[PDB]
């Protein structure tokens, strides 16, 4: 991503980052229960958030 992220005006990227943590909590909820089969989604959701915290930080220098 990254280059796709940079086309967002530092406010919707706050909303996209917020909506990713909602998914991450739900994914951890099903893994504990035993209802998750695509366990590879755990790691790429985490790295999607870290990819957005970096763009916001470097934008404010």
């Amino acid at each position: 991503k990254a280059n796709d992220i940079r086309d967002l005006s530092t406010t919707e990227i706050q909303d996209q980052e917020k909506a990713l943590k909602e998914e991450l909590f739900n994914l951890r909820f099903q893994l504990a229960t035993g209802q998750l089969e695509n366990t590879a989604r755990i790691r790429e959701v985490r790295k999607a958030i870290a990819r957005m915290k970096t763009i916001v930080r470097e934008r404010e220098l």
């Binding site: 943590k21 504990a32 229960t33």
Partner: protein, 92 residues
């Protein structure tokens, strides 16, 4: 922390599920989260009305896997009960 950072995952066991019908839900929370933070974290995520929270701390068990000795993570377990005039949480 955030609401999603205070609460980590549910506890699904024989003791934990025997009280679901009593409107009591068992979670694993952050080690440094107070009883009051857990109350407002639940209402933000599930939009239920919370009546009580009870917390307890667990040590780490000494475990061995061959010539190597160590400890498991220490846990903080919270049990949340809700008011009768409120929705339910589906562990499912």
């Amino acid at each position: 922390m955030d609401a999603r950072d205070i609460i980590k995952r549910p506890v699904v066991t024989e003791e934990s599920t025997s009280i679901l019908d009593d409107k009591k839900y068992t979670f694993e929370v952050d080690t440094r989260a107070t009883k009051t933070q857990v109350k407002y974290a639940i209402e933000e995520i599930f939009d239920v009305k919370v009546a009580k929270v009870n917390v307890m701390n667990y040590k780490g068990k000494l475990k061995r896997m061959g010539r190597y000795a160590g400890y498991t993570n220490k846990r903080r377990k919270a049990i949340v009960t809700v008011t009768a005039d409120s929705k339910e949480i589906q562990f499912f």
